[PDB]
Design a protein around this ligand. Structure first.
Ligand code: TD3
Ligand code: TD3
Ligand code: CL
Ligand code: CL
Ligand code: NA
Ligand code: NA
Ligand code: ZN
Ligand code: ZN
Lengths: 297, 297
């Protein structure tokens, strides 16, 4: 059922697995993510960014998720506001029925980030909603999370989970040269905070997905994601929520491109989007197995 | 808000205009249809085929429509089961919260049609839901509607509206040679029944929509829809519900193709589906003005 984020992530923290947190912008993405969760017996974080909420309407974002949760009541699901940028944004999400919100003030000075995050936490905790915040700057290897800052930040804000920057970045172009992450830094943050941790920019760009996209005439020149083995290492190091969006998009649109390329007379939407859903579903299912949330219901 | 189909079509019948009935299969189509209704200040029939209901799930089909009705509470909307094929299908729709169902047994012999239609009407009227039936086979120019058949059919079945076959057909390829419809037959049917009438296969395939689809590499060789003038003539003749599906799909997919063509690196779903929604919304807006439902709220 729909539950507070911390219920799902505290279990993952206790047992040492990671739970994929998958973004959606419409019904097709949402359906595919739920079907994957049902097929792999996995709990789900379902995420909507502020841009996604504007596209859908916050009423429809929550409404669709509630319908899906009733379709699959045995699956623990948290509905999460990804990259909330203001107190008001988080407040609106809480009011609409989100069960988890991220307040992202990572680019503010430490004390400003802490003050804003603390303000969101007070509001969200009053409403039974969990909160994520961020420290460090998301970019490839000051910059990265400062573990002693994290220790103080978490203690003083009472935030439920923290996203520490350890060398990932958003999007399909995460690394020029060989992938590298600061796992020692991650482990120190985990020791000092002892809460669930969140990895942003965690898409892998898997080989089969890249191949699907390129085969359909797509251009992914230069793209590189987080290696599977690095995602596993991150979970061993204390990551329990693994934000994944780009992988889902590439897989889905590859299938849309393929149909568009091949059958010029095709305009039945379902013929584009059924294959697109299937590819997205399969990406999510494999990722659930990789991170270890498979079979945790 | 969500109202019985007859509430909308009786007003159309009384005041002599047509109300477009638009199919959807997902959030994008539905959102575009509602935004059109809102901008044109027009009542809406929103319909879902059994195929669309399979694709979405009936819980999601109805659920999304209810959320949209809450978003635009001032718009009269009927949620209509398009081409229901069995009593059980119509019953499932009624229980799920549809406010209008079509029982399509036009392929049965006249008395089989009447028997089945009468059973559906009894069940539907008992639940405050309106009913559409059909007489004639839906091909171009025995087959077409027999006005005397219609007279008896309506009086004894108590069906709320009737779809008489007068020369239209489903899909992009309605006519070889210049379009022709049997408006005399239409007018006779209206005179004998004096209820709201429904035109199926009413897509026009507008020049600008064709142009968009062809420009994006699509193939629509040999396609022809109902001329705008003919739709206007149908409404003058007593058509109050005008089923439109193909026009919407082509305009939508034309934009998806264009996006795929113009940027091989593009895989943000919103970048595909925002232009698609806009093209679909514009088709609907123009159709509402054409049929005369603009400003009828
Ligand atoms: O942390 C996440 C996931 O990042 P990604 O899926 O690109 O690895 N996000 O904030 C999503 C951003 C998508 C980039 O355009
Ligand atoms: O009457 C119609 C629509 O007719 P059109 O194909 O002209 O849009 N419908 O009932 C919708 C489904 C038919 C498939 O196209
Ligand atoms: Cl940030
Ligand atoms: Cl039929
Ligand atoms: Na997040
Ligand atoms: Na119909
Ligand atoms: Zn992120
Ligand atoms: Zn039809």
């Amino acid at each position: 059922m729909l539950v507070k984020g911390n219920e799902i992530l505290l279990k993952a923290h206790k047992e040492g697995y990671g739970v994929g947190a998958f973004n959606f912008v419409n019904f097709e993405m949402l359906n595919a993510i739920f079907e994957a969760g049902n097929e792999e017996n996995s709990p789900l974080f379902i995420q909507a960014s502020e841009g996604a909420i504007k596209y859908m309407g916050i009423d429809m974002a929550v409404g669709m998720v509630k319908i899906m949760c009733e379709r699959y009541p045995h699956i623990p699901v948290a509905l999460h506001l990804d990259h909330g940028t203001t107190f008001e944004s988080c407040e609106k999400a809480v009011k609409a029925g989100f069960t988890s919100v991220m307040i992202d003030a990572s680019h503010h000075a430490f004390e400003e980030n802490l003050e804003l995050t603390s303000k969101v936490v007070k509001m969200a905790h009053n409403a039974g909603v969990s909160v994520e915040a961020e420290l460090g700057r998301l970019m490839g290897i000051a910059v990265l999370v400062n573990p002693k800052e994290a220790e103080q930040f978490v203690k003083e804000s009472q935030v439920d989970y923290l996203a520490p920057a350890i060398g990932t970045s958003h999007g399909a172009f995460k690394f020029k040269g060989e992938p590298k992450l600061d796992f020692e830094r991650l482990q120190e943050v985990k020791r000092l905070t002892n809460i669930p941790l969140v990895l942003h920019g965690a898409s892998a760009i898997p080989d089969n997905v890249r191949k699907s996209y390129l085969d359909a005439g797509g251009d992914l020149k230069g793209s590189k994601g987080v290696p599977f083995e690095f995602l596993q290492e991150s979970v061993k190091g204390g990551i329990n929520k693994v934000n994944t969006d780009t992988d889902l998009r590439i897989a889905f649109i590859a299938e849309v491109r393929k149909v568009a390329n091949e059958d010029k007379s095709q305009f039945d939407l379902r013929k584009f989007f059924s294959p697109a859903q299937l590819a997205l579903k399969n990406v999510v299912k494999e990722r659930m197995k990789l991170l270890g949330s498979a079979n945790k219901i």
